[PDB]
Amino acid sequence: GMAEAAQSVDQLIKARGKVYFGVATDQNRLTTGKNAAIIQADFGMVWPENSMQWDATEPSQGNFNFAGADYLVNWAQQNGKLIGGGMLVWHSQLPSWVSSITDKNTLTNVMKNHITTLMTRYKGKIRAWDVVGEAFNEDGSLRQTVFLNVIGEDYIPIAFQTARAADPNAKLYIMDYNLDSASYPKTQAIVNRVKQWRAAGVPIDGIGSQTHLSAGQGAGVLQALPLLASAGTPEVSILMLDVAGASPTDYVNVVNACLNVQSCVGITVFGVADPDSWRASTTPLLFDGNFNPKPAYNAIVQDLQ
Ligand SMILES: O=[N+]([O-])c1ccc2nn[nH]c2c1
């Protein structure tokens, strides 16, 4: 048929003892193309690209919109897929009403209410939440977001403690990008800070590495991911994965990094088909514009056998 025979990378990675091979998606994708069909066949977990971000879910203080998030949760449950959520605390997609707050107590209450409301709504149904995203500067210091500037460094401890109470079953992650190389200061810095936060009792269950790679950089993940795992969190994960050129070598190296790290639970790719990627011109995903698996997909299948 037009659809091509294939194997599920999610089925294969589970048979290797990992939890999932996942994909970022949302309602716009699930209703179009072959996205739903490919996700049903080949992936075991879904993450909302945008529908759980702060601008989508709490556009006005205390006025929540769960329509896109509900769609994804409902779709995942109906299709037997795990669900991840996030990002609960992130500077990038933040409504103006939040970034304009200057009172530390107010912003703390706002952040806690945002975390608690989103996590409570889906309590027991979500595998993992990305509680704090992109909290680090490239030099390893903390990024000067409204949360850091107004609340101070304690915002990370408070966010995680609040998330734990909202849904004790969820795995709570901190996530950042440019953690793909051991040579990079951000990688060692997040490890050191996470070690110190865990010594302070912060319930950081996971470090998620947002893995946007250019050609050849897969090999670096083989040293970076073990370094991330040395922070001692229960879990690490590869997330938002895409690879310029989608070389089988790079993708297989990332997969093998996860297989080589006992605490790595799985891998999430940043979409299904190349034309829908934020980097589409670099054809960086595992399915082409015809929704057929690319050589990198086949190479992952062969590596996971
Ligand atoms: O693993 N992901 O691709 C992914 C996509 C969007 C997200 N928002 N929060 N966490 C996310 C993870």
Numbering used by the authors: -2 to 302
Sentences reproduced from the published study:
Here, we investigate the molecular origins of the nearly billionfold rate enhancement achieved by directed evolution of the computationally designed Kemp eliminase HG3 (7). The Kemp elimination is a well-studied model for proton transfer from carbon that has served as a benchmark for de novo design. Although the first-generation HG3 design is significantly more efficient than an “off-the-shelf” catalyst like bovine serum albumin, its specific activity was further increased 200-fold over 17 rounds of mutagenesis and screening. All HG3 variants have an inactive conformational sub-state, rooted in the original protein scaffold, which was gradually supplanted with a catalytically competent sub-state as evolution progressed.
